[model samples]
Target: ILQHPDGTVLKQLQPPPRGPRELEFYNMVYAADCFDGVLLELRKYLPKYYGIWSPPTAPNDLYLKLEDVTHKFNKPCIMDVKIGQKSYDPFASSEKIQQQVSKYPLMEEIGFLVLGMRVYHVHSDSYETENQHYGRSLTKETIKDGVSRFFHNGYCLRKDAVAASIQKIEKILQWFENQKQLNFYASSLLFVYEGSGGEVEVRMIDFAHVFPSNTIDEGYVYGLKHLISVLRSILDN
Candidate 1:
């Protein structure tokens, strides 16, 4: 929900299994005296945290008050791309693992999955949305085309926007390449750009499956590297 006055976002905290862990993840990253260098550097790629809030009427219910990443845009074109070879955590049940893998079998090899996106069609002055089903239909050979479609506006390719997105994504890739503080599963990178177009924004999101680790997140790094290659190929041709 979008909060009034500041255009911030109020994400309802999930129940049990994941909610508390996600909250904990945010708390650690945003702690006042947060001395962890990786998390401190990582903070810039995430939404600004504004603590917790509860409506006066529903005082017991909680919500995370966060920066609305889309707040500054007049017409934002947004896409959600899940990073990593697998979406399930180490603790996932056999049934859960099977369910996730079956949904997108190529996720193991591609390392990234386009969960969904909305592109603004300039000619029609309308938005075109592709759901998860559409993303799932893409084969390895057609994945590049699927990604390129996000920058198309029913007229021409938004090269500048794609370049800006690549720049931001590259920074994220660098971070993943070096960090050994956490391993993220089922997390996504949210790519947003203006419908009219120029600049772009890529933010790391969905930390429910983030696990603290002493080893680098190889799966995420793998996905990010491939994603960069795809974006570059799109820009080259």
Candidate 2:
């Protein structure tokens, strides 16, 4: 894991093309670039952020950091960067609970941006079991659950907060609506982590699963529906 100055691990991989395949290529390029840009831009203003420990053996394994920077008035949220271990999933096991409990103190300490946090290694496994149990077999649902869990459980966002987060999500979706090839993953949500202040905030980090438009509209729709179900569950409870 070659850590970059901005806290992202740079791994060597095939770059996407730039022509008829431009859409696909652009998606990859944009994601990598956006992540790098955020890290580079914010590192200058904040404390020295540490990158994940790089294993000397696995060179191809790319570990990227998901981070958010809100205005200085909110809590500074940050996620634990674990490598090789499975990402958090509600249906998976007690592992997530343990991880959350362990990090709770750190979150309180770095209080700056309300939503200043990160989620690492957000792959399909993050929601595979929940999707199966609920009969949701689409990308959107998987992605949404991943995001909801990050807030509802990860940050203990209340029902109102969850709803507000969903509204923010809709805005992001609309922002990328015209760009057919541009798929939006709820990588991070930004808001006030603490008292009302003039600073912008971000919550929910980690965006490894976001990728090109692989599945069709139908699949995507199913995924979205699954995500809605997850959100409803959180609200109804």
Candidate 3:
């Protein structure tokens, strides 16, 4: 990923079908000719799309010009949480399914999985990170601690950030509850906040495994419900 002076981020398009499918999803959501109620509502939770671009030196490679969600933050505390009970799509091969399950076996029960996170430690005046390995090691009993860590800055728990995240996620949940247009697999909710204090942001990302659907995304809704309750628990103190 690359940063643009225009306050945008450049996401390098992946190879083959993944890139194409993601591009299509963005186009459908941002289509100028028509209005899709669900899609329009979803627009609020996604990064603004600015079509595609290719560097002059690498004309063959394409990138998605997207809104830099973290552009306004001076010290962003970021977390990427992969949602849904299952990460693999229905068309996934047995090997792929095995790989995903092996990575996080409790995913089906927990409904959500953490990919990575970085929290600014005000006391230390530095950033601390938790990678995938730390995430995979978390069990249902300890998952909340893992998530709560994101809102901590060594000195104290940022309940305000947690509360703000829960509020925004609740709205995202509302959108999911009312929509039946797409099913997302291996998709994630990217959360960000200024370490000191400010509004929290949660945006849905990763559409490579998104597929058209006639029914609601039960897995996603299930995960979202769990996530909200967990965040709520964080504010109990």
Candidate 4:
């Protein structure tokens, strides 16, 4: 017998003494397979359990409809991007963001998902102050040094940085290709930012950080170069 976390118990049945062991075993196997098949089919049309978002008191039929909508729009590009508090936890936020972004009419115009953002307020403040100081009295060299120190030492690298960068580039390329294939306007631009935090838990802060690319060819070239460099560095290490 086995028990699962959801409080369900699986009890194994013993073969009857009158039956041949091999025949009984085969029959049991067949029965198990048939049961699994039925369950799988039922699951396809069943409502999903949402522990927090949907309350347990929700009506069964309404819950089933909600589940159907959720299932129908679960694919990539159908949903917006997600930015989470925890590092490497994009999928969790992605699901929620997808639902939220789907409500917007502008979503079709953008042709891309806009997920949540993460930002470090303290670092942003400090950077702004330093920039003001530089504009007032500090030399160009001093300003550059301050900016470098801020990025290199103050800002932390996000856990999803690598994956997010790769995805952003790939998605832009895919969008560009689709636009060309369909003979539409192709806007190929992407923006990414790193946020302030400790090395272990950095966030990606905002959507305003992104901008439209002036030249798609240049963007592709730069993106490919960076991608290759990152891959080579990882492989070498």
**What C-alpha lDDT values do all the predictions have?**
0.88, 0.34, 0.91, 0.29
Positional deviation of 38 in candidate 2, in angstroms?
A: 21
What TM-score does candidate 2 reach? 0.33
What value of lDDT does candidate 1 attain over all alpha carbons? 0.88
Which candidate number has the best TM-score?
3
Q: What TM-score would each prediction reach against the true structure? A: 0.95, 0.33, 0.97, 0.23
lDDT: which is higher, 2 or 4? 2
Q: What is the lDDT of residue 207 in candidate 2?
A: 39
Q: CA shift at 108, candidate 3, in angstroms? A: 0.6
Off by over 4 Å in 1: 1-4
Name the top lDDT candidate: 3
The digit string of per-residue lDDT tens for model 2 on 1-237 reads 244555343433324321223223224443444565433443332222333333479854433322224324323322221111122222325775567434332222221112223322223213111222121121332434444444432334446645654464354333333234423222223333332112223233333333445333232233333344455677765
Task: Report lDDT (Cα) of residue 87, candidate 2.
Answer: 26
Candidate 3 deviant stretches above 4 angstroms = none
Q: Give the range of the ten consecutive residues with the poorest summed lDDT in model 2.
A: 78-87
Ten-residue region with minimum lDDT total, candidate 4: 61-70
Model 4 Cα lDDT, one tens digit per residue, 184-235: 1111222234443111211121121122233333333343344324423333
Cα deviation of 216, candidate 2, in Å: 7.8
